[PDB]
Amino acid sequence: AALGDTATAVRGALDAASKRELGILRRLSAGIIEIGRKIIAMNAEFLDDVEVVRITNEHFVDIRRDDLAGNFDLKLDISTAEEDNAKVNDLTFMLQT
Amino acid sequence: AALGDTATAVRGALDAASKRELGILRRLSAGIIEIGRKIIAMNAEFLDDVEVVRITNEHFVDIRRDDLAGNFDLKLDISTAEEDNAKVNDLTFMLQT
Amino acid sequence: VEVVRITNEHFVDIRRDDLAGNFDLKLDISTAEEDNAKVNDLTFMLQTMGPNMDPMMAQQIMGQIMELKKMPDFAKRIREFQPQPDPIAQQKAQLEL
Amino acid sequence: RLQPEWSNAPSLAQLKQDYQEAKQVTDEKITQINRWLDYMHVRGEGKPKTEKGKSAVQPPTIRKQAEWRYSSLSEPFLSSPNIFEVNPVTWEDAESARQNGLVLNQQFNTKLNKQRFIDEYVRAGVDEGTIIVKVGWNYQSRTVKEQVVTYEMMPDSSEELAQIYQTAAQIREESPSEYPEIPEDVRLGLEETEANGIQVRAVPVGSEEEEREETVENHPTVQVCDYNNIVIDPSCGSDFSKAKFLIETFESSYAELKADGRYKNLDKIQVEGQNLLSEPDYTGPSEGVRNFDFQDKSRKRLVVHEYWGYYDIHGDGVLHPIVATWVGAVMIRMEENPFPDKKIPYVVVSYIPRKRDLYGESDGALLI
Amino acid sequence: QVCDYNNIVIDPSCGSDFSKAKFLIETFESSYAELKADGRYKNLDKIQVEGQNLLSEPDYTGPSEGVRNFDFQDKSRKRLVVHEYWGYYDIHGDGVL
Amino acid sequence: HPIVATWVGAVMIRMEENPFPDKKIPYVVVSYIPRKRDLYGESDGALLI
């Protein structure tokens, strides 16, 4: 609403629209996270240490038999460029001071 | 009201709308807080020290038998990003000076 | 004992003359803006108070800012912290000689 | 008798008796809420009756309004990485505080959905006027394991043993989480190393045995509810801290009841009965599902009544917090309240308050 | 507790002070078990709880109209009506309240 | 117990316990717009007809 009469009077409309879209976005994100956790669980055992080393080029890290899908040691979320930039800026600033 | 005639004349409308929403938000927040306190009380005894250690990776802190749901030593509230940012800024500033 | 269980400080005796204050307590509604004003006044006046002695007082103030900012452990540690001088008084003694 | 030491225990007659006298009150509110719901979805009496040959369109507005409030209400909870935030009250705290906060936040993040939960929470609140939430604990076990072994003691001591034992002690000191993951032999030799001199080496022997049931599930649970299967004391005014009884009807199966080890008399149920066809029964998700069944005698659907409240178990005229659960005509459970706080494990929140009443008002109750 | 305005009667001669009102009467609702639990009463055994049936004119005006027909028929949770009178009186003959 | 059974026509080809590390059904269901006590959601343009 108010497709141009004041700079502020158009900001509200886009704000409300984005806020409404956000819920659907979050539901889809939750679905993707669940898929990812299942994939991690399957990677835990079906895959071999030499195969993992071939990718990581680092010494194999052992696996905890209690949990295989994390739920105790991993936090899983969708990565985005703005969060990457925030992390880089924080690192640079806090190193420099 | 006043969907665009002056930058200030549109700020009042959104202000009043948000102020009205705030009461409902607070009621729902109170409900969530109550749920959380009940959950803490149940965690107090139904859960084992080895189980808590497996998560925290710190030495188990003993439990006070007087109260189990806090009410004497815990303040429970909804966390939000802006309060997190405020805490970080306060820490940084007050450390630096 | 009930009051101690909450405050974790030594019990303060009670005056039998009045029980509802009316002689020693001023009661008012707390609000965030007054809290911010108090914090700002404390910070400013600490940072520019002067060379006045009794640094214990400065420690008390700084601990109060900690407590208002909800880090009671840091508050207690600071307010009970005792500064200790180095071994440079040897220099003064030797130059006196 | 399930409680031989209770001088005056309730019988199934009194429980159903009190159940009847409260539906007479709750039915009014149920019909009111049904009328409200029949308008946001244009159904039943919300559908206008029009003559043949004229239009029958009907623009939704209550739904229109609710769509623009759901997200603005639900956002301030999910916008943050974790919901709760625990802070100490006095400096004696800040260890218990940190530990409890971390545990609770992890539980919400992983075990419970929290997403479906918040969505159903806000939606029911907006378009029904009240939210009921049931809080409980889940504890599944009995999955036995086998094949223990045996280690013989040995007084051989050397330098490598000292190094390994020192490292294991350091691990047990600073990373207690990883300590159980170290090998069993070296672990037990390590505690032997302080049981006596360093001579201990604990050579294996071998054995076999079948014990040590594992806890496959141990956690909290939070379900919202349906508002058609819950009946509360109507004399409470609006406190819910003074309500004297709450009754809930839900649906389960014989296998699930047996798996949840909290019941007796399970063999006198006659699962060839209910057929999920009774008046006050579990109001199913829809109408079509009423015709669905399993015909397996292990997954056949049943209807279970639960009664939480206060009663005069003895003759002393002092009320105690009790819970009673029954199916059909058989009492399955009678006990005192087992939760650490002797209260009803439910939480009721009213969207828009009303004068001295538990139930609220829906958002679109005035736009009809 | 807040109150209901239908169950409270005040001295009407006070003008508007409430510091000079001489009596206040409140009617509320309770049960035999609750009264016994609150250890502040006597003669509890001469109540005849098979009486009131919550059907009297000045009685507790219930939350709604439907709830007037609800009862417990247990003799321990049956609902009663209680009158309270706070005020000043000439207990002795001295003419001092 | 968690099991899986696979058949074609009238011949049973596979019967086994669940082989994945987490003994659950290897499916994920997401509802676009929620409905009261139902798995299936509602399409976006369900009200524009």
Order of helices and strands of chain A: HHH
Helix content of chain A: 55-70%
How would you sum up the major sheet of chain A? none
Oligomer: part of a larger assembly
Count of DSSP E strands of chain A?
Answer: 0
Measure the end-to-end span of chain A: 46 Å
Supply Rg of chain A. 21 Å
What best-fitting shape of chain A do the alpha-carbon axes yield?
A: elongated
Biggest interface, CB < 8 A: B-D, 49 and 50 residues
Classify the secondary structure makeup of chain A into a structural class: mainly alpha
- Total helical segments of chain A: 3
Strand content of the residues of chain A, in percent?
Answer: under 5%
PDB class: viral protein
Keywords: portal, tail hub, tail tube, complex, structural protein, gp75, gp83, gp80, viral protein
Entry title: Pseudomonas phage DEV neck and tail (portal, head-to-tail and tail tube proteins)
Chains A, B, C, D, E, F: gp80 portal protein
Task: Provide structural commentary.
This is part of a larger assembly, with 6 copies of chain A. Chain A is mainly α. Chain A has helices at 7-46, 49-56, 81-96. The N and C termini of chain A lie far apart (46 Å). In chain A, 2% of the residues are buried. The interface between A and D is medium-sized, with 12 and 16 residues. Strand 1 of chain B pairs antiparallel with strand 1 of chain D, so a sheet runs across the interface.
